[PDB]
Every structure is written in structure tokens, then in C-alpha cells.
Amino acid sequence: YDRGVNTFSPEGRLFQVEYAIEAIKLGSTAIGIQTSEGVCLAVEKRITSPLMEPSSIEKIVEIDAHIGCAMSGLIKDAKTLIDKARVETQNHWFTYNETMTVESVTQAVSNLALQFGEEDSRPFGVALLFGGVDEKGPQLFHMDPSGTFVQCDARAIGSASEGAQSSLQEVYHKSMTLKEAIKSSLIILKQVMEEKLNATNIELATVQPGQNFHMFTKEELEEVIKDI
Amino acid sequence: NQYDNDVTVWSPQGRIHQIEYAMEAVKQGSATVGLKSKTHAVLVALKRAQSELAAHQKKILHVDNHIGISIAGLTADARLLCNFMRQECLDSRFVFDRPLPVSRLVSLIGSKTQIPTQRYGRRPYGVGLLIAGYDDMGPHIFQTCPSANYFDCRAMSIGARSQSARTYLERHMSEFMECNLNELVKHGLRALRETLPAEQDLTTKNVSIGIVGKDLEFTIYDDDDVSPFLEGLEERPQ
Amino acid sequence: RYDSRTTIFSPEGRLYQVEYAMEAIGHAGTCLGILANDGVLLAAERRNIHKLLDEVFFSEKIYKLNEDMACSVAGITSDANVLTNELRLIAQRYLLQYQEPIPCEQLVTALCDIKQAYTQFGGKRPFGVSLLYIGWDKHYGFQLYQSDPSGNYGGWKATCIGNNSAAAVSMLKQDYKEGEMTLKSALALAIKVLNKTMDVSKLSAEKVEIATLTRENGKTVIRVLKQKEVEQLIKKHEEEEAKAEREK
Amino acid sequence: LRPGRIDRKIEFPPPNEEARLDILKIHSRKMNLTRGINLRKIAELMPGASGAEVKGVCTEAGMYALRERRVHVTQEDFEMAVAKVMQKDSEKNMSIKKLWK
Amino acid sequence: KRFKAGDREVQRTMLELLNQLDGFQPNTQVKVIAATNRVDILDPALLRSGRLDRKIEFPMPNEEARARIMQIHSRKMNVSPDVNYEELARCTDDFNGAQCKAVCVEAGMIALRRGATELTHEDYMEGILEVQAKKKANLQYYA
Amino acid sequence: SYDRAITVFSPDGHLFQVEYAQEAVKKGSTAVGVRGRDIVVLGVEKKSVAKLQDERTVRKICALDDNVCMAFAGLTADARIVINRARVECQSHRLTVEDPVTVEYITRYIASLKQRYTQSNGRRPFGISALIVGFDFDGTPRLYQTDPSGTYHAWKANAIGRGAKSVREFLEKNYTDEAIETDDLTIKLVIKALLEVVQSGGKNIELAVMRRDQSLKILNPEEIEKYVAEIEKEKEENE
Amino acid sequence: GGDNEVQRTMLELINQLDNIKVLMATNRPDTLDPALMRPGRLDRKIEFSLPDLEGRTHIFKIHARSMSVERDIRFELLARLCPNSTGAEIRSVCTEAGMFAIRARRKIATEKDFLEAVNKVIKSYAKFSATPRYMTYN
Amino acid sequence: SAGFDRHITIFSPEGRLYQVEYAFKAINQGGLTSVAVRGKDCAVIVTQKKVPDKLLDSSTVTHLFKITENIGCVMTGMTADSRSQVQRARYEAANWKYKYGYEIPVDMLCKRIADISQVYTQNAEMRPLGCCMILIGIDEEQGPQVYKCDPAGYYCGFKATAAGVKQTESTSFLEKKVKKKFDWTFEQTVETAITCLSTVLSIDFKPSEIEVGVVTVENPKFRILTEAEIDAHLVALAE
Amino acid sequence: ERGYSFSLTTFSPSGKLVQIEYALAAVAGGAPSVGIKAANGVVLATEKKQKSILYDERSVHKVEPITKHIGLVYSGMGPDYRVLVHRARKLAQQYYLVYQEPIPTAQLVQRVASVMQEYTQSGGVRPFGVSLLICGWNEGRPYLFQSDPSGAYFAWKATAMGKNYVNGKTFLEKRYNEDLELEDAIHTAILTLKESFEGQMTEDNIEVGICNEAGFRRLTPTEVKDYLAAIA
Amino acid sequence: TGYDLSASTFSPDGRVFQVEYAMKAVENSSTAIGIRCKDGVVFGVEKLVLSKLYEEGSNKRLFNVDRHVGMAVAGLLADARSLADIAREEASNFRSNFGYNIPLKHLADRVAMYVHAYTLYSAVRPFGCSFMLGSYSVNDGAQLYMIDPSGVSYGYWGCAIGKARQAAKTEIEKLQMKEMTCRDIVKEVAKIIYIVHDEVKDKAFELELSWVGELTNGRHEIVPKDIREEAEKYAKESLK
């Protein structure tokens, strides 16, 4: 019952999308918190050798100037889905002359995701976090290989998803500021990280309504972690 | 046994095991209660949240100004069927310039979902749809089970632990016709609460209501918008 | 086991179906190309030498591709036929498009590109036929090219395929001659190796086929030797062999 | 087959001409060979004859004299006995035989 | 079935049994019955005229039979008046009668765990899920 | 039983067919590539001459474009096809966009070409992982590594083939800024990197170097021999 | 043969089975007789599945209550590095952490040893999942 | 002797297509048999009309079908596939007449039909139609001809033939008849067919139990004799 | 080899395409047919022995023409032979339409074998389980070719497939001399089927096609009866 | 076993097992009957309501193929709806191509060919429903046709489909449908369908009837309510 995306288990489950979801646990922890001030996005680098360029590891990519992205799982599937997101939001801007809402970009990415056995392949073994600011305000959206897209005030994907999520429920609350959200996310990441936290072990990215520029953290990661 | 791997094969007892398994996908989703009066068609859905601090999933979808659904099954199949409905409704409004009657939409859904259950290359649509609509022939409530079989339901509830709602609806079946908006919505809320476990109770975040009426289009009430129907609900006996 | 399809990768990373096609060339016929300057040859063998076989082609194992290209064949008959048809078609396409003969390697590259495609796309059995190529061009002159059912090729100075391929290549290496490889010496070496790699002795002329390519007045005449010249060649080898017994 | 259990792994290849002639001479020592029977020629008529097949050839050469009530075996008695013991089964089908060029 | 091994003692028992079934003729008040879950391994000599004969056929209960069977084994338990035994039968397939009683037993046990007196339909559903050792997890990809 | 298909996920979310594709490169010859300040040198080991075949048709380092070159591993049959496809693609990109391809763009194209082969049933993945290194970036040298799965990564230096673990581990300890400060030192870095050959013969090492706005220059077996001798003389300091 | 002897012993046991409570444990429940597994002899069937993360931390804490560990150990972190791990392999990881802390003469088993113990108990025998083929997950 | 069988495209080790073999054993599933015999100037076909109820519309139970005004056929096999073969043959005959300008000879008719059935045997797309076609018709310059052509695609001319459960017995009885040569007139041909079916079935043949089709050179038109005519023929057979 | 004999696109560990061999075994279990090449022409003979007297012996012909100068014979699946003869006729007509000269035997056999190879390269299509003997009179020298389901076309001087084919070849190489003529080629061909045909040689049981200077033509039963009375 | 999984495989006996399985799936459906009157045809179908929550007149099993053609499916209802759809498409195509209402014989033959076409490929399955077609025309009389899942289609004077096939055949054969005008054969159909469906099993049930003939002027529309009430009352009077 688990050899295809076309077979249903006797208890009713598609025992192929579940396996794709299990592939997320084989990624790296990614933490995102949505606040009124903005949305943060922290990710473990998990570099394998010092020789590889840190910029080569694309864990936080940019769908557009107004929404960030976080990945966990397959690099190839995620890059395929990301090329969909950038192209889709650019097409939406071209046709409607406006910035796409993060919910709509997540909808398009999911619409691509709902095609593993819904055409006429395999589910994309990657979970996607979409953080950005829109008309309704700052918003964080998370989607899974099944294409189920939902918004989360603060969500953690990849490895340590259960532990990071559980430790995030206790610390997070609605009236949170961006600096405190960054500090809390870094604290959770350091707690759930296998290696000691430093500048090169993580990348950070924040999205604010008024500073839709600077969708990264270059060399000032050292300042933030040193105040932990 | 061995005849439960493909829809194309027939079991010795004259059953198709894949659809019987597809039937089970509906019960995986949360319970959703749909009931119609002589003047309104309202379906109430139990929304679930994957985590404490994650927003509850949308259970009631918008198909047209006079047809709306609640989904109980697979999310991907639900989205695909909703997109198919929206495209069909737009085409009908474009070509006949008339709000397409809900029965024809349900028949088209049956025709489309009957395709996977006869040709290999696609799995059955593992989603259950409570189709609520208002055409010129009065309010309606349909349920499209994944077996491509649809029934004209006066009131129905599918999903996880949805049976306790069905026995409540069948018990208050007679009085559903001569009900106004608020009383019918309260009956639906009572059924949905019957689906809930003893510890859980309907709060403003886990319940969603969508109503289509004589002069009212299909409108989604969530968060604060469900509260006007949530207030006045009688507390569950305990 | 992981040899059900040609597109299945073994846990060790080995394409089992491909190697099954590779090792199956041991059942193919013996065709070899000897080292030679100002010329080059292939020496094929006729397994089916039954008397009731009427001979009409005289080149059942030797095929001419271009006006300056010739190739042997070793594999399944139908695969060899379709492969040589594609060979001639590609060579003529290049001749039409560039108004210049195919420069040897690009034709072999074309076949290997076609052949590997069967080893990557599903539903197609890999071409189980390996084939030598000879030819001349204005780039590198006489060349000898080794096709391999995996789509892998390689330049060579002396090689053989088919039955007793290892013995033939080892014997060719035993007397391997670089530079001093005149056409007469190449023919003598071909007959000398065919005497041993073929189980049947005395090397009957009708059971041995030699095809030679030489540059004559800028024409690249491709020759298949008739029964008389093969007879005198095996006679020369026999007379040479008689002298070798004077050691005792 | 790992060493420490099997130190030497001795191969027994089919005998060569100078070896098959030896087999022909040890299995015909008790045989009343005539004059002019070149045992090397019979050995030359058996390419790759296993080694037991040489003894079979000797036995059948003697048998060809038993059915004639004699005690001596001639060269023709061996040459006509080589084709009997050293018989071969062909494919007997050109369609299968030309599967491979 | 038949097969000097150590089974030559039960063989005499079986043959003596066969002798007594064939010894007594019908029309007397010595009607015999025998039960077994595997007739595949039964010696057909036992299933011959004059011996047992008239093989009664016991099938796996169908949906209505499953609902009825689940109804009988809950009469002694304070089951709630609103339990759709028919729906229970729909959700119970490939289930023998022993499991159709174990579902009621497990439903009562789960009701005791929940600290309730009457057994709701959800208790019966959890009994169905637990009689086959399955654990019900709310999968996130359905919604 | 989760490894006889490419589009079947293992219970733990593994594409075992994809993983088995990375076994082909581990069986191929060792290829090393390090990026220098002005000379990006890539080298290959284990030439494994058959002593009867001309080495021209054996070439493993090929230039995809005028300013980019790539050395592969794994099986050559798929390597030739990816060679031709990359060459056609870079020429086509030069046609549609006047600016010639950059190293990252050609690496992305190769990765996407491999991924579209690993994405569907009935199509076996390219069983190679190529080292994309070139100076087409117009000022900043870059070197990349593709994977048979379809993932491309940028390294300051890499090592692929049979011996990737050992060469990579030894390369970290001696890859620093002072080593790459000189072009000759940069090529000597390749020299000692491939010096850990299977047999360490020293005559089976083929190194190619490309410089800023220059042409590809495969080292002749007299400059390569001279550099090997120079490295040995530098290594003679241990005595 | 003698196989039917233990067969008849099992049949007699089933006869005895069908205030007495009976316990049975097995790691291969598919080899048992269906008659013995029917809910007239075994009315309940409890499945001991692989523990979740929260249970894996609990097992780690139980097996490390007597160990001489440093009071900073992130057992929650260690649980996530043992996916699909039985309760016995966690005990082996705890034992091997002290093994590593004994190999080098340290009387306190720090967190670094526990990661090393995991890399050799779990990762060294879970699967291959090597670095050259693990550059696809990130 | 199950063999490989399960796929029609797979040859057995001995070289017999087992799946195509089972089509013939599917032919006689209907429990009916049809007998064709060629006279000196006519061809007649007699089939079994076993209506196992009083509610069936006896008009539509016919196993005889009219493909063209000059050629008729009788069906032995599964009813659905027999009707499908009838529909295909009607289209084939119409296409022949429209393409070449004259009516199709009976031989070419299920030469084409057996050609269609043969492609179904090779390509693993269509399950072979489990039914035989027995065709009669007056073609000029050769008189009446009868053709029986099977799912396997083998067609031949028969002086008389029969397919069904009682096929071997019927063909044996014809073997007995066509040998003692006599004047095969129309009444003699009908008598021979009636005797065939009666002897193989040992049935008195109530007039509602059979359907006989006649094609004669005098009137080259497919005709199904009504109940009274077959009653008269049965009476003439009686005396 | 044991489990890989099913698929025709899967090599065995010894690299044997077992399905083609099974198709050839199906060829070897067919009706024996013989063709021999004389210095005057080519003669092909086959036994069309029906299972009963009930059959019309003149209905279906085994020895069949393609062009005016080429004839075919087979030993195997007759339904498969019909599609083969149809495609061979189409290919010959296509060559005639383009080159305006009649198809040479070598080329026609090459393209027929290529048609045979088309059905032995993908799953779902079965090899043409018939072997074909093809004659030809062209450029003043007779031809006799055999094409098998494997697509390997030979240049048989004289051969015989079908049942007891080994004994048929054993008869040849004994009474077959290269310098014979057509008239005794008929007698040799009739003799060859005599060692395998179980029964009396009646004029509607052995069909012979001479492929002479004038062209290939299937012998009418009267001439076959004349030759058969001559030999007997 | 082994010869049963695919509909393109023939058993060693020589039968398509998938087809027989589809047929034995139809017997797991509520009984539907049809008796053809002297000047028309009448259908009586039993609709077992599965729950009180279904609205009256839901998932109906009487379909209108065309203006004069009628449909009385029995089996799994999804394939029944699809078969109704393809039959309506065929009828519309025939009307648009030939200019007149499609004859019942031709429509039944074409629908049988469509049904039979799905019992030949391994990629599809035989339909799980068996249905009766009926129509009346002054130029063709009245016809009734069964098209079973295998694809066979021959006329029935009176037929039944569902669980109680033989049980309804026995009570149909004792009627003279040749003569009695089906003004009262609707009444007799209600009677007969009330004999079948023992009340102990299947619980509640609901009965739908439709007719074709001179009475309805060629059409097939459902019988008016007033006649249906009296027909049901007359059916209930046969309790003894």
C-alpha cells in the first residue's frame, strides 16, 4: 500500500506522502516567528566541510523583495519549488501590478505540490516556511509535501521539529517584539543544535513592513549571538 | 488480500477494495455538520490546529456566490475539487449567464470522480464534500463520498467521530424545515458539539460556519464572525 | 537482485543489465584490428561456415560506413544491422550538412551517443553489439576505434572482441609493434593471431575474412580480400611457421 | 576456500598434446598394440579430451577388436574409436546459431 | 494426515474413532458433531460416508451478521441507547465473531479508562481501532 | 524492497535509487579541483593506461565553453552526454543572451538536467558528479561540484572519485590563504592533492589550469613532470 | 517427526487457556497460530512501538539516573539523534558514553561523549547514509 | 501445463502462446454449437437457440447476424465479443466496398477480421475476442464458400465446419459424410446440417430450438428460414 | 536465465535473449517447408496438410508471391505469416514506387528482417514466430534467403525448417549438387518433404513454387501431381 | 487466482474472471424490475434508503437516456451514473447525425459495445452495474433490453435485476404481459416488487416507478403521484 501515490491503505492513508514528510526530519532545524514588528527566520547551517562556500548552502532564499523563505529536506525538490515561487510572484506582479500576498505565494507553491499523483511523480520531500509582510500585516506560512498550507504564529520545521516546536510554544506570545523574537529563536536553536552556536553555524533573516530590504544577516550575526 | 492494491481489480465478493479504503479517508478528517431548512442551507465545520500556536485549518471553502462546500478528507483532493467547481461555475456563469443549479454541479462532480475509480493512473478523490447551495429550487445539501456516489441529504455529518452528529440530526430531523437562520445554525452547532469529546467544547477558534440563504450569499464566518452565532448557544449538559 | 531493468542502479552503483550486455559479446565473433601505419585492417571470423550456406555478401561481418570508413560487428545480428544502418545514415547526414567526410571520431561519438541513450531510457534493451571502426581523416589519419555496448568507446592501436578476446589481445600485446607496423606485417600478425584465437587450426581461407583500408592517391580504397589473396596470405604464414620449428 | 583452510588450490586443466599422449600410453600398456600405430596422431585427433576420454578411446578401440574376436588393435581401430568417444552435440539450428554474428 | 515416528499413537486413536463412527448405523440417537478451524490438515478418511459427513460451513460474518453479533455481546453492558451498530458493522470488516466480541470488551474497557458509565459510539470506534492493535493518530495532511 | 524504483520513498524518506547513483562516482577515478586567486587548477588521477590505447579518446577534463571547464567522475557513458548537453546549452545561452554563461549558471543547468532525470520513473540518473570550475565570472574565480542527484555546491576546493574521503580530509589541513597566494603554489597544491593516488605513481596525474581571461591549458607530460619533480624537491625538506 | 509434539503441547495450552491472568511476549507475532491470537485466549494485544521523542528523552533520563554525567546534558537533543530507535539502543548509547569517558581518563561523561556514543551505536549501524550521498538533505 | 501464459505476448519455452490457447476454450463457454456445410450450389448454417426462460424476447436471441446482403455469419463464443466482431466485420465490409467499388468476397472478409484478431494477439493492448466466425456467401466464379476463422487469426476454407462444445463430434460426423460423395443439393445440404446438430446433441429439435441461415447461388442473399420452413425441413428429414 | 525468459528487453546473466529463442522453438515446431537453389532457379515446397478432409485445400496458400519474381514460404504461426506477407508486399511496392526497379532479393529480405526486428525491441509486442524462405531472380543469379524472428537473414543455398528439420538438412548435403537444374530441383524438393510428411503425397497436400527465369509462380495442382507421379 | 487480477487474462477454463466478478457485484444491489406492456414498457425499481437523513427522491436509480428511452440501473451507482451519461451522449450524437430518435435496439447495441469495450483492457474494469433499457414507438412497438456487465444485450418481455433476480422472475412469469395494458401493469409491478425484499433484512425501502408508452405519449417521465399511491395501496393488500 506504500509503493505509490495512487494506493490507499486500508485505514485510508496514502503511505507515500507520509514518507515524504518523514524526509523533513532528515533536514536541518528552521525556526520562524511572526510578530507585529516583523517576521524572523533562523536556520542551522549544518556545513559538512570548511571548504564549501557558506553562500552555496541556500537554506534561506528570497521569493521576492517582500517575503523570505526557509527550506528543510531535499535540495533539488526545494529548488524546483522555489523557482516556481519566484516565477509565480513575478508573474502575479506582471499581470496585476501588485505585490503578492504571502498566502497567495504559498497557495501557488502548494498548487505545484499537489501534483505528485494529481497529474493526468513523487511528493516534494521538503517543508517550506514562507515569511513576509502583506496588506493584512506580517505573516508566516508553512507547507508540507502534501501541499497542506497553513499560517503559523511561530513554527519550526526540519530536524528537531517536535522539540523546537514544544520549546517555542512556551516562550512565544502574541505581543512580541522583533528583537525579543530574534533572541528567543536563537535561544531555541542553540538549545536544539548539535554543535555550539556561532556566526558560521547559522544564518538569520528578518522581514519588516518598513525595511523590506536586507533579507539576510551578513557579519552582524556575531553581534546578535554574542548578546545571547 | 491481493485484490486491494488497485481500483481496476474486482474482489471475489463483488467489491472494489480501493474505494472502500478511499471511504476511510473521509473519516480521517474532522467532523463537519451540514443541515438545511426551508429557507437556509448552513454547514458547520470543526477546524483543527496542528499546534497550539498555529492557526486552525480552513474547513469551509468558497465555490460560488450561491454554492459553497466543507471538506472532509484529503487536502490536495479537496483543493483540486474546489478548483474544478470554481472553474465549472465560472464557465456556467459565462456561457448561460445563470447561477448553475447545485444538482448539476453535484452530477458533474460525480462524473469527474467516477473517472479515477475506473481507469488506472489515478487514485480516487479521497475527500468528502458537503455541497451547500441555493438555486431556484430551494436550499440543498449534498454529500459527495469518494465513491463518486452523491446523495441528496436533508442534513448530514461526515468526518472523525461524525456519527454522534448524525444520530442527533436524525433525532431533530423533523423540525429542521421550519427553522430560521439562528435556530438552524444553533442546531448545527449542537451537532458539532456532539461530535466533540467530553473535555473539548466549541470555542471561537475551532468552529467555522458557512451559510447561504434566500437573499444571502455564501459567507464564511470565522474567528470573531462565528461569535454572533456562537453567543446564545446552550451549554452542553454535564 | 538488480538486473530486472536497464535503468536500475545496483547498491554498489553497477548497471547490471549493461554488464550483462557487455559480457554477452563473448558469444560474438572474433574481429580484430592490428597496428599499421599507411593502412589499417580488420580480421573477422565466420562461425557459420556450413556448406549449405550460399555466400552472396562476402562481407557478412565487414561493413562500409562512409567512403573512408569501414566497421566490423560483434553482437546480436539484428542490433548490428540497425546500428550499421544508423551509422551509414549519420555519416551521410554529416556529408550532406558539411560537404566533408565524417572525421572518424564524431561518427563513433554519434553511435555511442545513440547507444548510451538505450542504457538510460527505460523500456529499451541496451544494444548488445560491439564493433571496431577503421577510417582516415585529415585530422589524425588512420585510426582504430573500439565500440562497446555501454556506449563507451576508445582509441586503440590493436584490439579484438568476441570469442577468445582476452587471448587475442594478449597475443597482440606479445608481439605489439609500434611505428614499425607496415601493412604486410599487420596482415601477417592478423593471420598469426587468428591461427590461435580460433580453435580450428590451419586457418582455412574461406573461414577467415580480412578487410583493409589504405590511402591511395587520396581515394581511401576500402578492400575486402578475395579467396585467392587470403589463400596466399595463409600460405605465407604456413611457410613462415615451418621455419619456426627448426629450434628442435 | 579461504587460506588457512585451503592453502593450495590446485587446478586440473584438460591435458595437452604431450600429456594426452602420456594418458594414451598408460592406459594402453596392457593393450596388444600393433606395429605402426602412432599414438601421438590419435592424441592429435583429441583436442581437449578431458583425460578420462582418452581411457574411453582406448577402451573403445579394444572393443572394436572384441566384436571382431581379435587381440590386436590397429591405427584405424583407434581413429574410428576417437570419433565415437569424442562425439559432440551441435546446436543443430542455424537460426539459434546465427543469433550472434 | 498420515505419515516409525512417534505419531503412531494418536494414529491409533484416530483409527479407533473412525472404527466407531462406521460401527454404528444411522436412525439411532447417537448423532455426532465435530468442530475444527482447519479442515485442510484433516485426513479425508474422517470425511467419508458413514463417518462424520454433512460438512457444515462456517463463514466470516457479513456486515449485518457482524452488527448482530456485536449487539449480542453488549447486552450485559450498559451501552448507550444511541449506538449505531450498523455503522459499527460498516467500520468492522474482515472481523471474526471473537473479534466482534472483543470490540465490545475493548469499548467497555476504554469507557472505564475515560471514567464513564455508558458506552458512547466513540468508545466502540476506539475499541474497533484497538482490537486490531492500531493506534489512531490525527494526521496533519488530511484536515 | 524500497530500492527498485526511483520515485519510491523509503519509510525514512530516502530515495535509495538516488543514493545508489552516488556509488558510481565513488568507483571512478579521483578528480581534484581547487580555486586559486588567478589560476583555477583541476587535476585527475588514476589514468590507468592500457598500454595499447591512445589517450586522446580517454580525455576526462573537457571545456564546456571557452572560459569554463569540467572534470567528471563515475561512468563515462553519461559523462559524454552531459558534456554535449552542457556545450549545446552554453552556446544556446550565448545565443539568446549576449553575455556568455557564468560558472554558476552552467552548474545550475547541469544540476537541473540531472534532476529532471532523477525525478521520473523509466529514466536512470546521470551517474556522475562533475567538478564545474572556470573563470567566466569576469573577475572572481569560482568552482562548483554537481551531484548525480541534482544538487550543486560551491567549494573553495573539492575531491571526487575513488579516494574522495582521503584527498578531501588531507586537503583541509593544507588549504589556506598562503598556499593559494601564488599561481605556481596553487598548481603545486593540486600536485600534492593528487599525490595521494591509489599507487602514488606520480606519472598518472593530469592537471589542467585555466587563468583569468586565458584559454584552457592541459599540462604537457613535461611541465606536469617538472611540477611533480619540483613538489618532490619541496617535499625533500622532510629529510 | 517430533514437531507435532510441541504442536500438541500448544494445543493443550490453548485448551487450558480456553482468577488467572496470562502474559505472552513476542517480537515476531506473525509466526503465532491465528487460533492462539484470537481474542478468546488473548483478548488484548498491546503493541510496543518505537518510542517517540518525548519517550526517548524519558528513557535516556531513566538510563542516566545512575550515570556520572555532567549536569548540563541535553537529553532532548540526544533523543532527536536517535530516530526510530528502540529502548534498548538508548541504554546502549548511555553505556557507550561512559565507555568513551572511560577510554580517556575522565570521571564525568560530558555531552561530547554522548554524541560520540550515538555516532557509533546508532549511526554506525542504522544505515549507510554517508556524507557523499547525504549532500542532498539540508 | 499452465506455463508462462499470464501475458499473451510471452512465448512459452516450447513455443506455444498459452493465453491465445485459452481463447479457444473460452469459445465453447456459451454452451451452443453452430454447424456450417457447403453444398453443390448453396451454404447453410445451423446454430443452437437455447432460450432458458419464457420471458426472453426470442427475436433478439439470434446468433445469426447479417453483415452484408451477400454474406452472413453465425456466432459461437462469448456473446459480447461475438457482437463486437460482427460490428467490426460490418465496418470492414463497408470500407472494402467503398474503397474498391465492389462487394467483399467472403474470404477477404475474415481474412481482414483474422488480421485484426492477430494484431490483438501480438500487441498486449486488447484481450483477444473469444469467438469464432463462420461465414457463408455466394461469390461468383467460385460458387458458395464457407470460412471458419478463429480468435488466433487462422482462416481456411471448409467444405463444412462446426464450432462449439460439440465441435469435434460434429466435424467427425462431417468427416463421415463428405467422403461418400453425393449430389449436394440445397435440401441435401440443409439435411446434412440438421443431421449434424441432431446427432451431436441427440435432440429431437423442436422448431423453436434452432436457427438456420441459407445462402444460395440462385438468390445470393442471406436468409434466415422462418419457423414453418424449418418445420417442413425437419419433417422431410423425418421421412 | 530462469526468471528472465519472460521479458524480451532484459538480458540474462549470460546475455541470452531467451524470448527470441522461444519464438525460434515455435518456428521449429511448424509444418516442414524446404527451398533449394538450383543453377536454373529456386524451388520452394511446403506441406499444407489439413487436419480433416473438411478443409478446402485451395483456400489458403502457403507458398505465396510478393512481386512477379519473389515468393515466400514459412514454418510457424500462419496468422503471423499473413501480416508478414502483407508488410513484405507493401515494402516491395514502396521500393518499386521510388526506384522504379523491382526489389532485389537481398534488399527485400533486409527490410523484411528489419520489420521482424521492430517487434523484438520493446515489451508488449511479440516476435514474429515464423521463419521465412525467400527466392529471387535478378541480375542473372538465383537467391534463397531465410529470415527468422530474430531478424537475422541468411543466404541458404538449400535448407528446410519446421518439424524434422534436422533430418531434412541431413537429406541435403547428400543428394544436393551445386550444378543441378530446376527440373531435378523439383524432385529433390519433393523428396525432402517425403522424409517428414506422414502420409501419402496427394496433389493438394504438397504445394511447390518454382522461381525461375520467367518469375516466381505457385505450381497448379496438376503439375504438382505430374511431378509426384514421376517421383513415386 | 492469478488469472483473476486483470480483465485481459483468460483463465485455464476459458473465461474472463473480472467480468464474472463484476456480474456477481450486481447481485449485491437492490432489486429493480421491468415489464414491457402491449403498448409500452414499465420499470419498477427498489431504492433502499440507507439512512433517514437522505432526502426523499435521492440518488435515484431511474434515469432518462433520451426523450423516449429510459434507464433502470442496478449495481454500484457511480458506474450507473457514468453509463447513463455515456448513453445520453450516444443518443444525442445519433440524433444530431441521423435526425431522428435513436432506436432502442441500436442504442442498446451501442451501449453494450461501450460496456463490452471496458472488459478488454487491463487499464480499465468491467462496469459494476446491470441496467434495463426501455422505450415505445408507434413505428417500432415497445422494447426492453438488459445490458449486463459482460456486454451481452437481448430483449426481455419482463426482467429483474438485483438481489432478487430469480425471486422476481418466478412472480413475473405468472403474468400475461402480452395482453394486459400496462395502465394496470404498473399496479402489477408494484405488487411484484412488494413480494420481493423480505422485510426482515434490508430494513426500510422506497419504490420508484416510470413508464413508456401511448399513455405517456412516447416519453419516459415518472408516473404521476396519484396513480403511484393507489398502486402502492393495491400492492400492500396482498399481505395474504
Residue numbers in the entry:
A (entry chain K): 8 to 127, 134 to 241
B (entry chain L): 4 to 241
C (entry chain I): 4 to 251
D (entry chain C): 306 to 406
E (entry chain F): 294 to 296, 300 to 439
F (entry chain J): 2 to 240
G (entry chain A): 290 to 307, 314 to 433
H (entry chain G): 6 to 244
List sentences from the manuscript.
The 26S proteasome unfolds and degrades hundreds of proteins to maintain proteostasis, regulate cellular processes and generate peptides with second messenger functions. It consists of a 20S core particle (CP) capped by one or two 19S regulatory particles (RPs) that gate access to the CP proteolytic chamber. The redox-active thioredoxin (TRX)-like protein TXNL1 is expressed in many cell types and was proposed as a nearly stoichiometric component of the human 26S proteasome.
We refer to these PSs based on the highest substrate-engaged Rpt subunit in the staircase as PSRpt1, PSRpt5, PSRpt4, PSRpt3, PSRpt6 and PSRpt2, represented by ~19,300, ~112,200, ~29,500, ~32,200, ~24,200 and ~73,100 particles, respectively. There are four subunits, Rpt5, Rpt1, Rpt2 and Rpt6, bound to ATP, while Rpt3 and Rpt4 are ADP bound. The resolutions in locally refined maps, focusing on the AAA+ motor, were for nonseam subunits generally high enough to reliably determine the identities of the bound nucleotides and distinguish between ADP and ATP.
